[PDB]
Every structure is written in structure tokens, then in C-alpha cells.
A paper describes a structure:
The conversion of S-adenosyl-l-homocysteine into adenosine and l-homocysteine plays an important role in the regulation of the methyl cycle. SAHH depends on the cofactor nicotinamide adenine dinucleotide in its oxidised form (NAD+), which is self-regenerated during the catalytic cycle. The protein structure of SAHHs features three domains in a monomer, the active form is usually a homotetramer.
Structures of archaeal SAHHs were determined from three organisms: Methanococcus maripaludis (MmaSAHH), Pyrococcus furiosus (PfuSAHH), and [name] (SacSAHH). Comparable results were obtained for the SAHHs from Crenarchaeota (SacSAHH and SsoSAHH), which were only active with SAH or adenosine as substrates. The motif HxTxE found in SacSAHH (Crenarchaeota) shows the same interactions with the substrate adenosine as in bacterial and eukaryotic enzymes. We observed that the exo-amino group of adenosine bound in SacSAHH forms additional hydrogen bonds with the carbonyl oxygen atoms in the main chains of Glu342 and His344 indicating that the adenine ring is in its preferred tautomeric amino form. Similarly, our complexes of PfuSAHH and MmaSAHH with inosine and the complex of SacSAHH with adenosine show a closed conformation state of the molecular gate in their active site. However, the rotamer conformation of His in the His-IN state of SacSAHH deviates from the rest of the His-IN conformations among the archaeal SAHHs in this study. The side chain of the gatekeeper residue of SacSAHH (circled red) shows another rotamer conformation than in PfuSAHH and MmaSAHH.
Residue numbers in the entry:
A (entry chain E), B (entry chain G), C (entry chain C), D (entry chain A): 4 to 415
Amino acid sequence: RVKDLSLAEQGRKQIEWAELHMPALMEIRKRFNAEKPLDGIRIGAVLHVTKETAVLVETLKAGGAEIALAGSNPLSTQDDVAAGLAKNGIHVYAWRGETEKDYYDNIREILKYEPHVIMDDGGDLHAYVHENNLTSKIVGGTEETTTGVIRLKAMEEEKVLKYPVIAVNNAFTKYLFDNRIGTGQSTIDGILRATNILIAGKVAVVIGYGWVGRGIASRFKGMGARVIVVESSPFRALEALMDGFDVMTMNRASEIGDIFVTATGNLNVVSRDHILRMKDGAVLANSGHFNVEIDVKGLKEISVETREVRQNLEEYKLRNGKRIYLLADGRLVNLVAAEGHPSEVMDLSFCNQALSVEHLIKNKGKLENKVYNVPIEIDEQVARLKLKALGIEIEELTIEQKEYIKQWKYGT
Amino acid sequence: RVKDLSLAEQGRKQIEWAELHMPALMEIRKRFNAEKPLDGIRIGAVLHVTKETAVLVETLKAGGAEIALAGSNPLSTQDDVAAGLAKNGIHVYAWRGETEKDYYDNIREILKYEPHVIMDDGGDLHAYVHENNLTSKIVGGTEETTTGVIRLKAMEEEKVLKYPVIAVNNAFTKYLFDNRIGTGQSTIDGILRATNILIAGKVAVVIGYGWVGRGIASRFKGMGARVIVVESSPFRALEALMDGFDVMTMNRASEIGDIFVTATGNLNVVSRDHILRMKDGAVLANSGHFNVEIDVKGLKEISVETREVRQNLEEYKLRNGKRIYLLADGRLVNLVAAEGHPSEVMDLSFCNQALSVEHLIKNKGKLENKVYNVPIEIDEQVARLKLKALGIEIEELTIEQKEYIKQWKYGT
Amino acid sequence: RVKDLSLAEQGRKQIEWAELHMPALMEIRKRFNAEKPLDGIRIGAVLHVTKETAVLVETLKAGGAEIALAGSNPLSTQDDVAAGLAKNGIHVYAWRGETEKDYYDNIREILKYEPHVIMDDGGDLHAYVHENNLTSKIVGGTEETTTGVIRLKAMEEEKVLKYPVIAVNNAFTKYLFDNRIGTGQSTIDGILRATNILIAGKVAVVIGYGWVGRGIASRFKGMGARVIVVESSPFRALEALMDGFDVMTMNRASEIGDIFVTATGNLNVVSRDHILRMKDGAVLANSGHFNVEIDVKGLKEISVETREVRQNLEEYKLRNGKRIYLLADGRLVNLVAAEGHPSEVMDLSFCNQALSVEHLIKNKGKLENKVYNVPIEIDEQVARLKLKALGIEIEELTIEQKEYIKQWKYGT
Amino acid sequence: RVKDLSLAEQGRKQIEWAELHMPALMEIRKRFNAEKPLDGIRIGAVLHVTKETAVLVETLKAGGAEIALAGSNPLSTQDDVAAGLAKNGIHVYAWRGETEKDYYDNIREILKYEPHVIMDDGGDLHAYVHENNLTSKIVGGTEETTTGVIRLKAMEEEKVLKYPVIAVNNAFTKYLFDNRIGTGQSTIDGILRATNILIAGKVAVVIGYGWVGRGIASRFKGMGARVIVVESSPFRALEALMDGFDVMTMNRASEIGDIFVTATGNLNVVSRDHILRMKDGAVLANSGHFNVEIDVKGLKEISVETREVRQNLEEYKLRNGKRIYLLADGRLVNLVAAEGHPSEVMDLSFCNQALSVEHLIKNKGKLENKVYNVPIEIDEQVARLKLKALGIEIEELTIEQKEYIKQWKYGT
Ligand SMILES: NC(=O)c1ccc[n+]([C@@H]2O[C@H](COP(=O)([O-])OP(=O)(O)OC[C@H]3O[C@@H](n4cnc5c(N)ncnc54)[C@H](O)[C@@H]3O)[C@@H](O)[C@H]2O)c1
Ligand SMILES: NC(=O)c1ccc[n+]([C@@H]2O[C@H](COP(=O)([O-])OP(=O)(O)OC[C@H]3O[C@@H](n4cnc5c(N)ncnc54)[C@H](O)[C@@H]3O)[C@@H](O)[C@H]2O)c1
Ligand SMILES: NC(=O)c1ccc[n+]([C@@H]2O[C@H](COP(=O)([O-])OP(=O)(O)OC[C@H]3O[C@@H](n4cnc5c(N)ncnc54)[C@H](O)[C@@H]3O)[C@@H](O)[C@H]2O)c1
Ligand SMILES: NC(=O)c1ccc[n+]([C@@H]2O[C@H](COP(=O)([O-])OP(=O)(O)OC[C@H]3O[C@@H](n4cnc5c(N)ncnc54)[C@H](O)[C@@H]3O)[C@@H](O)[C@H]2O)c1
Ligand SMILES: Nc1ncnc2c1ncn2[C@@H]1O[C@H](CO)[C@@H](O)[C@H]1O
Ligand SMILES: Nc1ncnc2c1ncn2[C@@H]1O[C@H](CO)[C@@H](O)[C@H]1O
Ligand SMILES: Nc1ncnc2c1ncn2[C@@H]1O[C@H](CO)[C@@H](O)[C@H]1O
Ligand SMILES: Nc1ncnc2c1ncn2[C@@H]1O[C@H](CO)[C@@H](O)[C@H]1O
């Protein structure tokens, strides 16, 4: 079930472009097409349907797996890529422009094949599978994003998890590169595609200085902006301060910011009261998963006029007469107003993704009520695969250097 | 003569978007709509048909002028903006996808109105009127880009220039922001729209360290890239070196680079021989005017296979089998793969444009053989308008301070 | 025992300057002078004898402790600060220019008072006390730097450690600001004081991309240098690559670098054979603790001439005829060629020291052979104290926000 | 006449250090010692007596010139370098700690040899020579700094100037590197030597966004500070805003800034009323020539108690009780609290110096009443000499490329 099966030829060129820029995932595909480690394994995945998800899902099929795919976000599907995937053997039930009903119809669709492994992005598939008492034949799962692992850890503290799950988000090759480097470029890209706004002179307010937010602040600063950071963590506010960024409350930032981007995993982090004090022409965007970081509800009630300027650009006139610009319906603007993270960075996360599924199948003595970090050996193999593909040589410790480091005394 | 007038409503929404972010040009429109300084003046323009050129030409029409507009590059025209301009009173002969005959047909159309003022971007319109012996009724003109000013300075050395022309490119409020800050964002934006390539880990080669090239290198570096500069000027190469960038010849850079962007006003700075030595997957883009900085004709002859991967992304197979990616067919990647400079920066550039046409009509005792710089009084009013629009106060010198600096003797 | 007790007035002005720039440590001092949590406690300390160490030990004296202090490095001691510290009640055995025999004689001196708590900087005091069986009355200790933590953990896996030790280096408020921010500024400052070298156009090689090396690379880049990273960890090599730095082996960097700075906890990281490959004029510096990161013993044997150019700058002429400049005899150049970390950054590290030393006395039911990280409560109190002192307001999470974070169930 | 002739050995090691780091000036010295272009010429110079002036002054002696040297600033002289110069053949009258009477006594000393050439830094020697009716035997002169060029240009408008003067400050290889890159590092180095202040977390105010101030802002930003710019020109305030810096008046910046550095050529730019509004602990420093940018005379009259904390750091207690720290007594902090610009950058400025003196001797048909910019041929030789010494290759323009640049017509 896709939007237009006629775009598969244009979409196929997009997956090959992504393949040529995912050398590490292509190297794993070769061991997969040779040892077929996922033979007879049925995978249910709710992921962002991109050209990069296509390289991972088709790499898993090369390992002998049967995959059912559903979009992780109702506006994230690249329609051409979904067409190209259907023309192959991928049971893809997703298209851009879904409604909330279509979203869960597509999730029930991927679930009729009765999967052994559950691959999820924001936590919805793990929640639905548990809330409707499936889980029976499920051997394990993986979680791709920060918000999904928090839901999964809450599930695990409640003794509700029924299969072991790998938090691929917690791998060094993921959150240090996907969340930071990838979202830094992608979020700015989405802002520029939805609006051709000048970054140079503007006061940009980044709410959240976690891995996503510090990458956004870095690239706003690299684009010439005056960066303001709002944080609730004492540690991360001091990090942003010592990195040269003005740190303050949203109450103060509400009056100065020209662009506000949210990168929390939290609710109404930009609230209706905040928006009332904002300047005329202020642009709002969200980079966390789920459209609840900005009070989009409040903005619609305090508003007396809405209109679309263009794709992903919505204008709201408040009673005070001032105009507020919402980007991408408050959904993660990188994947909705643009294409998400580059193919080169998703190479790393989808290498942990692919290898963590092989690890889940190869094992079955794991705890069905436990959230796992990626095994450091898999984490390290991904890094060596990327360096190998990039032609970067690293120093090898000498024997005298390995000896000196085990030592605590001296050497007369 | 445009592509589809059915887009006039969407394009109008784009021009209104530009209007709100070009506040300094809007305040000039107010004094223009009241004093009608260009009443009875007919203007012929070769500019990039964008939402920002739309705000400039309609600002000119408010001053009482009749305007004929033709596209400056055959792929830069925004079709909806061209439609919206047709719904108003602008005689626009341009559309995306033109041919060289269509380009010069649209220029001959512009010349039927017997223009009083000639507004040009790349110098193509000024050259035509002189080479085809029109210019009879022309009172003056303006030049927007570095390439056009060089030609007009060459035209003036041969005493073929027939009217005074203002080098709007040379105004401080233009080349310091349009050429540097504007192209820096725009070119990265165009690169990211034609390819979703990660800039962070890459070796980016910028050929040309003028105002355009240093803005591009700054933004490559701000996006995380390893920047290499190729320069032919000893001064600007030493500047690029002291700005922390690796400086070398194209022969050395060609074997190392992942992305090559050209920003000269010159010919074959990325040559046939350079591409033969480049890595597999190297991306080529041009930011200067005219498609001759990269030898695109040579690339077609050393190629055995060509293919379009996506809009504005052409793939070439070489005899060695290595693939070379060309962006926007070697045309300005900012204006062809994206939307050009933000409206906020073109506000500064088009304030000189509008004020320089008013300056040409108020005067008539200028040299019909001279390229002029923008009058410094106008140059300083543009910056004061932006600051007044942005809410930035500057310090005013006290009288003891103004006197101290006219003094040179012993004692203060 | 200090060099000249007559400088006690000059040192006092230096210690008072630090007090004004360690505001968070002063509020701990006020709560110490009132609650005297360290009554009847004798402390033996091996630390860098600086104005900031003076503010910490006197904060310890105010809490009712008796302190014996010995220098952590034979060239780090500020003699006036030691004089000023002796004029009060601090048993300080240290001066600049010490011999290695003086170093270990001074350690027996502070160890004569039979301390209950051991404060060590590079691990030397923890080792001596253990190899010579003086742990009998020692109730606990603290460790300040990464190299000391590695030694203590080796003692811990080797099960010889005899008291609990708090790894103060591993606190977020320590390694994120002290190791990263402080050493970045301090090392560049030391390089500039021993040489007024131009950083801008130069190739600077940072060996080690941990917290110290990334801070050094950040400040080299900010001072205009072209930064090259050498690393042995695949994770950290990819971290350096994605941050825009060329990553290679020492074998390649040795022939291209102008400045070499070491930031490993390791031995012979810049070897005898690397220096023979270096260019005429290359500068060598070390920022990790202990002067064994640069093969300075090897450099002296392959050299034919050595001479002092100025304070902390020794020039060596090689058999090749080329000149190699060594800074501060390969000892930590930040603390030897300059004054170490600013007072504002050591405020954070020495707040952890005081609060974690008080924590060692508050308890006594802790495990022998156990290295602990700083309790997360104290780590956060240090962070909140700095924010309060800097006047920085942090955002407060609402009740609806704390609820949405525990949920994993469907419905928004 | 110097302070201590016994320091001549330490100074010579410092001049040798500069010679090894001024390769381009070392290349001119050999052409000078061979072609003796300045034989029989007497030169009187008022410059900062540094290891870098020593390399230039001895380079002039190598060309056959007789040189008398006096310090340009009473606290800038490097005493060991002055001793080393006196042991050679340099009539040097300078020492650190001069009084204003000593300053002009020393200028009369160097003026007793009746020089044909005047080398000046801040304009004082040009002013004295004109105000006391000498100039009789003077054949020409040079000006090194911006402040001197303004005074000399007023002398030209007043028709008082009696010999031709070369504005060495206005050459690209000077103001693009000395004023910007050199002073940027130099000023931060001086601040760090007078105080070990953390730059990272601080608000730094740069008053003046010319070539000096923008270099200082670049280095504050590179050291992690939050940079605020105060400007009086609309053009440069817009330059500072688009470079990402908060721009405001001194009245607003005075209440926010932690460090204030002045880089104007102007008077009372930091006023007494401004200082009373400042935070407690604010640091003041000056980078423009002459100690009048900060109202230091006003600050001494508003204070109730003053004391020196360390070299170049005085603490002032204000009537409101707040503490204000002044650096280098309001004088160039780069040259008084540190060692001025690195030798690699002064290589460029003193190469223009050396080459422009010979150009003054080669000629005598220049208007003996006019200020000239450095001849473009010499500016270009300086750039190529530096590029060759650094091993940097620049691209050579093709014969086809040289033609395409003079063409203007349609096609070819
Ligand atoms: N492509 C993408 O856009 C992308 C990529 C990866 C992760 N993510 C999503 O981004 C979000 C964060 O990712 P992260 O890895 O940065 O997690 P993270 O939790 O490290 O960053 C979260 C930060 O938000 C701060 N925060 C929480 N409530 C706040 C409030 N009310 N005001 C201000 N700051 C507040 C926390 O202190 C924390 O530092 C998650 O929702 C994750 O799923 C998005
Ligand atoms: N929106 C845009 O895309 C935009 C904006 C402004 C200008 N431009 C175009 O950009 C080009 C230049 O802009 P500029 O303002 O940088 O002009 P500029 O001439 O200052 O910069 C040109 C630089 O190219 C260097 N150069 C020339 N030939 C070279 C070669 N063979 N190898 C290396 N370097 C070489 C020159 O030394 C000079 O420094 C012009 O064609 C102008 O029309 C485009
Ligand atoms: N004021 C200071 O100078 C200061 C402050 C804190 C720590 N330190 C010292 O700095 C050193 C490191 O501190 P860190 O916090 O950076 O610890 P860290 O372990 O994060 O950094 C160590 C890095 O060194 C790299 N490394 C080890 N051997 C290498 C080799 N042979 N070639 C290349 N890279 C190699 C490792 O990969 C590791 O990433 C330690 O000696 C620590 O005590 C100094
Ligand atoms: N080694 C050094 O420290 C060094 C080197 C070169 C020049 N200088 C001195 O530095 C000073 C500046 O040199 P420049 O080359 O920067 O010249 P410049 O004139 O480009 O910079 C001066 C800036 O100060 C601004 N200004 C004047 N009054 C102001 C005010 N009241 N408030 C705010 N801004 C104001 C002017 O608009 C101008 O942009 C000169 O006095 C020069 O002699 C010092
Ligand atoms: N191009 C992409 N394809 C697939 N997933 C992506 C892409 N870009 C970002 N993501 C993922 O989207 C998640 C946010 O929901 C992040 O965890 C991130 O890994
Ligand atoms: N969005 C835009 N609209 C109109 N002209 C533009 C735009 N972006 C760049 N330009 C102009 O294009 C010229 C290059 O031909 C530059 O001089 C620049 O001013
Ligand atoms: N100014 C300083 N005063 C005291 N200790 C310092 C200073 N600068 C750095 N250090 C410490 O020196 C140690 C290196 O041995 C680091 O752990 C660091 O915390
Ligand atoms: N180290 C130095 N030696 C000599 N002159 C210097 C030095 N640093 C800066 N200057 C000069 O001082 C002038 C400012 O008075 C500037 O023109 C600059 O060239």
C-alpha cells in the first residue's frame, strides 16, 4: 500500500544514490547475502520511509529476511522511495500525508505477518504490540531514537516488556553522530527549504542542549546566528554557557528570538504563553520526535487567522496582530521539510541497526524484560567499517604503550 | 510570456513573504509611491526572476515606472513568481527551462519597449544593446554582479559604452553581504537540495577566495567541512591561509576533494584534466555567473554515460569508470538548485538598485561613458535603513571626539 | 619549607584574586567555617601549588582540617603562593625548580603528619603510600586527573587499594570544563608565553582526542590554525573527523606539523623516529601529566646541541641539521610555561574536591579497594553553585512535563 | 642609552628567534647586504623596541644605513632587545618605564643625527619634526599604524607636511594581517598574561569593528566568549551583526560586559560615566594607540583606593563599592602585558617597511608634501615572499583565461 506506484523508477535512483553513500552498510550486506543469517526471520519495522531506510530494509532482506515496513511519521514518507520498495519484495504500507487512522491501519497491516523482530523509531510499535497483547512470537526488537528508549525504559521499570530490545540510539556511533552531526545539518536544511530565511543576523533560540540541540546550536552558529540556549539541566546549561552561548529562560528568550527550535523529548516546551510575548515574524520549528514540543494546540486557539505560505510554512495571526510562522506542522522539520539526516550518517546508525538484529537472532538467552545497549564489539566494528571506507588510518598502540597503562607504580 | 499563469496565487504568496522580509526596500517603496520619481520612465531588466526581484520591480512600478523583465539565467526563474508578476502589471518574458534562443528572444522582447533605464545582472543586456546598435534612447543603467561590472569596465576601456552605468555590485552594503554572506548560505543550500550530502566529514575545495568564495568557505567550515582554497591572487591566497584554510593548486586539490565549488569570474578553473584525476563520487558545483567555470562541455566528452539521479544532479561515468557528480548543470547552484539569497540580504542589494535608478533620473549630467560606483550617500542610507529596520542602535560621536581626529599636534 | 618566605605579600594578592574568581568555592568555605565538618582531620595533598590550590586548602583549613601540601610537578609551583600559604597555617613543602629527589623527599614530609585523607593529582602519593605500607590510618582519598585514575583503577583490579578513593576527575562538572575548556585555553596560553608564535597559518597536530585534546584542538582552531588529529581509538578518530579535522598517523603528521601537542595518558606518543621526520622549526609540547608523552629522553640523545632560547623554550639541533623546539622540557606546558587553568574553571574542580572530601569523612562504611565517581548529588551542587554565582537562570520543569516522561502508553 | 647593557645576551637570543621566524625580511636583508641600497643614509625611527624591530633595524643597517632608534611607547620596549641592539651598531635610546619627559628627550637624541628618513609609529616623530621646525634635511618617511596615518593626513590637508610619507599601514599585506590577525592573537595573549581570566564563559565588549577590532572579536569568539560589538559606523555595525555578534551602544554594553577592549583611534570611548555603570570585576584594556580610549584619567578620579595586583593589573575601588580592573595602564595591552604581535606577522609589516624605505631612496621626484600608500608592486612582492617561505603554491592563470576577462561581447 503506497501512494503512487508509478514513481518507483525515480525512487529507485534515490535508493542507489543512498547505497553509494552508505559504504559500511553495503559491506554488511555482503556478509548478509553470503551467510544468510536472517533466514526465515520476519521483521516488522516502523521507521521513517526514506531512501536510507530502504538500504537498511533491503540489506536485511539480503540476509534472508521478510520485512513489513510502516512509516514512523505521517509526513515523513518519501513517496518515490516507498514505490521503489514495493516494486521489490518489501511489504511497505506508508505514504506521505497519512491521517492518524491510516497510521495505525498501517501498523496493524505490518503486524499481520506475525514478526519475530520489531524495529521501531519513536516507540509506537513497541507500545502497540504490548498494549494489544501481541508479543507472543516476538523474539526481540530495536529502538532508534532517544524518545523511544525512554518509553522502553519506562516499560521496563514497569515489568511490561516481553522481549529483549536493543537501544541502538545509545551506541556511540549513533548519538554522537546521528543525533548531533546529522540533526545539526538536517534541521537547518529543513528550515531553509521551508523558508529561505537568512540565518546570519538572527537570534536563534535552541531549547534543549542535549545531543540534538548542541548540534543545532553548532550549525546555527556556523551559519552566522546569535545562539540562545534554554536548558532544564544544570550540567547542560553550563556546557552551553562555556561554549559561548547565552543561556536563559524561555520567558526571556521569548522576547528576543527570531527562530526557536525545540530539541527536548518533552511537552509544551514552547508554550502558548511563550508565543504571546514573541516578536512579529518569529519562526517556530521542532526537531524532537512527536509534534507536542511546541503547543501547536495553543497557537491555533490564540490565533484568529491561519494560512499556508508554502510547503511546511504556516502563518498564524495572533489577536495582538503579530504573525507566528510554524514549520512542518510542529513535526520534526528535518524529516518533514527536508530529507532527514544525510545517507553518510545513517550508515552508522543502520549498521548498528542491522548488526543488532543479527545479534538478537543469534541470541535468545537474553532478558525479555530488559533494554540493552548496543554491544561494544558491534559499536566498534561499525566505527572501523566507516574509517575503513573513508580511508582513515588510526594509530596502533605499541607493546610498550599497552604495558604502560596497566602500571600504577613506576620503573627505576 | 510565462510558463503557467495558473500559479499566480501561489507566487503572490511568495512575493508577500519576500515583502515582509525586505523592510528597507519597503520604506523606499513608500517614498516612491508618494513622490513618483520614476513617472514616465520605462525600465528594461535582465535579473533573476525571484520573489525578491518581484519586490524590487513592483517597488519600481510604485514609483510610476513601466517595467519589462527577462530572466538572467535560463534556469533561475521561479515560475509562480513570474505568474504573480504577470497578474500585476509587469511585462515579464521568462520561464524556467528556457533555451538560448528563448533567452535572447526574451531580451529582444524587452527591447521593444524602448527602455529608458537598463537594469542588468550579468552584463548580457548591456552587451546586446551596444552590439546591436540600440541604446539610442537609453539614459542610464545599473549592474548587479561582479562579472557584469568587469565587462562594463572592459566596455569603457574601448569607449563603446553609451550611457552612464552604476556598479551596484561595488557598494559596501552589497558585496559585503550579498556576495559574501548571501552566497555562503545560498550555495550550501543549493548543494544540500541537489544532494543530501553530509558536509561535516568532507574535504571541500573552494576555487576563488573573493567575497563569494570566502563566504562559501566560511559556511563549509561552519557546516563542519575541511576547507581547501585554490587562489590565483597572492593576497587572497595569503588571506585564506591565515583564515586557517589549506591553500594549494587545483592539481593537488583535485585528488583530495570531495566537493568542489567554483567562485571565480573566470574560465575552466575546474578543467577536463582536473576531473580525470578526481576521486570516485566527487561533487562539482559553480557559484559564479555563467556555466563556464567548470568545463562542462569537456566533461561530456570524457564521459561514456550520463544519467540524472535527481533534479539538478547529473551523474557522469568516466573512461576510468569513476563517477563525477555535477550540480545544476554547472549553473549557479544557489539560484538553480535552491532559491538564491534570502530575501533579507537582497533587501540590502535591491535598496541600492532602487535608489540608484532614482539617482540616474534625478541626474543627467553624468558621463555617458562611465561606470560609476554607488553614491556614498545612498550607500550609507541603505545600511541605516536595515539597522533602523532591525532595531540596532549605533554610537554617535561626541563633539570632543569629532574634533580629536582632526588634530595632529602635541596636546589634547 | 618554601623558597622565599618574603614573597608572602605578593602571593597573598594572588590568592585573593583567585578567591574573587572562585565564588562557588567560597560559599562552601562559609558553610565550612560554620559547620567545621573537617575537625580532627589531617590531610596530605600532592597538588599543583597554585593560587587556586591555595583557595582550596584554606577552604579545607576553614572546615577545621590540618593540611600538609606538596607539589604535584617539580616546575608547576608558584613560589609566592607557597610563601603566602606558609605564612598561614599550611604545611607546604614545595618550590619551583625542584629535583626529583626533592619531589619524593617532600612527599615523605607531608606524610610525616600521618594523614587520614590523601589528596593526589597524578597518582604519585597514592602509589608511594601503598608501596611503602602507610595506609594504616588513612580513611580515604581523592584523585584529580585522568592519569591518576587509570593508576588507581589498576590498583583496584589488582586489589591492593586500601582505602576508598573518589575519582574527582570523572565528575561531569570536572572533565567537561577542567579537562576540556581549561586546558584548551591554558595550553595555548602556555605555548604563547614560552613563544610568541603565530598560531594562524600553522599546522597544529594534537595527539589524543580525549577531553583535553578536543579542548586543545578547539582553541587551536579558534586561534586560526589548521588542526590535525592523531588518535588510537576508532570512536575518537571518527569524533575528530566529523568535527572537521584531518585525522592521520603520527608517521604522516610528523612531516607536516608545525606544532605538536600531546594529550594522551601514554608513553612515547611522539617518538624518536617521528622527530627525525619533523620539519625545521617544529615545536613540541605536552599537556598530559608526566613528561613521557614526548620522547624527550630520546630527543636529547639524537641531538648534537641544546640551548635555552628563553624561559621554558629549549632548542635542539639534530644530526639532520634541523632545529626542534621543546617547550617546558616536555612537562605540562599549561602549568609550567603559564599559570595553569583560570580560577573560574578550577572553581568547579576544587568544589568537587572539598565536597567529596567532606563526603569521605561523613562516611566510613565504604569499600576498601573501591574507586568511586563523585556522588551525582555533589556533582549537581557544584553545577548549581556555579550557575547561581554567574547569575544564570535555568528553566524549571512543570508538573505536566515531569508526568509526560514517565509515560509510554498511547494518548497525547 | 638603555637600561641594562648586561641583558644583551638574552636579547640576542630573542632577536635570533625573530630572524628564524621572519623569513621574508631575511630574504630582503641579503639583497640589502649585497646591493647596499641605503648606503650613506641616516634613519631616525620611533617604533616599539621589540625583537621584531631589531630584525628590521639591523636589516636596514645591512643595507648600508645608520639608524637611531627610540621607543614609540614608554612601556613597550623590550630591555634585553635594546641592550642587544646597542652592542651592535644601533643608536638606541629606549627602556621600559620611561617618563613622558624621557620619551621626548630620547626623540631629540635620535634627532641629533639629523636623519634623512623618518620611521614613525603613532605620528609623534612626524609631529615633533614639524612642530619644532626641523624637516630641513628630511627626504621622506613612513607610518606604521592607523593612528599615525590619520594625523599625517590632517597635516596634508593643512599643507604642513614637508616630505613624502609612505602609509605602510594601508598596504594589504599589513592591515589585513598585522592589524587583524596579529592584534587578535596579540591582545588575547596580553589579557591572559595580565590576568589568567577565563574567556569562555564571559561577555566581551569590543569597541570598534575595524581591522583591529574584528580580529579581536574573532579571537574572543574563538576562545569561547560571547562577543558584543560597539560601533559608530553604520557599515561596520552591519558587518559585526552579520558576523553573528550582538551590536549595541556603549550605554547598554557597559552594564553587560565582563571585559572591554577598545580598538578605535579615538578619545573617551570608554567614558567615566560608562565605568560607573559596569559590573563589579569588569576588566578594561586598550588596543588602539595612545592611552586615551579609556578615560583612565577619569577612572583615577572616580576611584577611592587603587592598588596593583600583578604586573599590568591595577585594581580600582569605585565609590559605589565596585571593583574595576585596568590593564597595562590603558596602553596597548598586546605590547605592554605581552610581547606584541608574533614575528611571523611582523615579517609582513616590516617587509613593507624595509622595501618602502628603499623606494623612498630610489626616488626623489615624489611630491615632498603627500602621503602615499605602499606601491602595489611592493605589496605584491611581500605576499609572494611570504608565500614562498611558507611553501604555498598558487594557481597560474592560463593564456585562455587571461583573454576571457578582457572580453565583454556575446560568446567567442
Ligand atoms: N532527526 C532528528 O530530529 C532526531 C535525531 C535523534 C533524536 N531525535 C529526538 O530528539 C530529541 C532529543 O534527542 P537527544 O538525544 O537530544 O536527547 P537528550 O535528552 O540528550 O536532549 C534532551 C535535552 O532536553 C532538555 N530538556 C528537557 N525538558 C526541557 C525543558 N522543558 N526546557 C529546556 N530543556 C529541556 C534535557 O535537559 C536534555 O538535555 C528526542 O525526542 C529524540 O527522539 C531527533
Ligand atoms: N548569487 C551568486 O551566486 C553570486 C553573488 C555575487 C557574485 N557572484 C559571482 O561570483 C563571481 C565572483 O564573485 P566575487 O565577488 O568573489 O568577485 P571577486 O572577483 O572578488 O572573487 C574572484 C576571485 O577569483 C579568483 N580567481 C580568478 N581566477 C582564478 C583561478 N583560475 N583559480 C583560482 N582563483 C581564481 C580571483 O583572484 C578573485 O580573488 C562572479 O562571477 C560574480 O558574478 C555570484
Ligand atoms: N591541566 C592539564 O594539562 C590536564 C587536565 C586534565 C587532564 N590532564 C592529563 O591529560 C591526559 C589526558 O587527559 P584526557 O582527559 O584527555 O583523558 P582521555 O583518556 O579522554 O584522552 C586520552 C586519549 O588519548 C588517546 N591516545 C592514547 N594513546 C594514544 C596514542 N599512542 N596515539 C594517539 N592517541 C592516543 C586515547 O585514544 C584517548 O582518547 C592525562 O594525562 C590527564 O591526566 C591534563
Ligand atoms: N598592535 C596593535 O595593537 C595595533 C595594530 C594596528 C593598529 N592599532 C591601532 O588600533 C586602532 C584601530 O586601528 P584600525 O586599523 O582598527 O583602524 P579602523 O579605523 O579600521 O577601526 C576603527 C574603528 O573604530 C570605530 N570607532 C571610532 N569611534 C568609535 C566609538 N566612539 N565607538 C565605537 N566605534 C568607534 C570606527 O568607526 C572604525 O571602524 C588605531 O588606533 C591603530 O593605531 C593597533
Ligand atoms: N534520512 C533518514 N532516514 C531514516 N531515519 C532517519 C533519517 N534522518 C534521521 N532519521 C532518524 O529519525 C529519528 C527521529 O525520529 C532519529 O533517531 C534518526 O536516527
Ligand atoms: N534570490 C535572489 N534574487 C535575485 N537576485 C539574486 C538572488 N540571489 C542572488 N542574486 C543575485 O544574483 C547575482 C549573480 O548573478 C548576484 O549579484 C546576486 O545579487
Ligand atoms: N591552575 C591550576 N591550579 C591547580 N590545578 C590545576 C590548574 N590547572 C590545571 N590543574 C590540574 O592539573 C591536573 C593535571 O595534572 C589536572 O587534573 C587539573 O585539574
Ligand atoms: N611585536 C611588535 N613589534 C613591533 N611593532 C609591533 C609589534 N606588534 C605590533 N606592532 C605595531 O604596533 C603598531 C601599533 O602601535 C601597529 O602598527 C603594529 O604594526
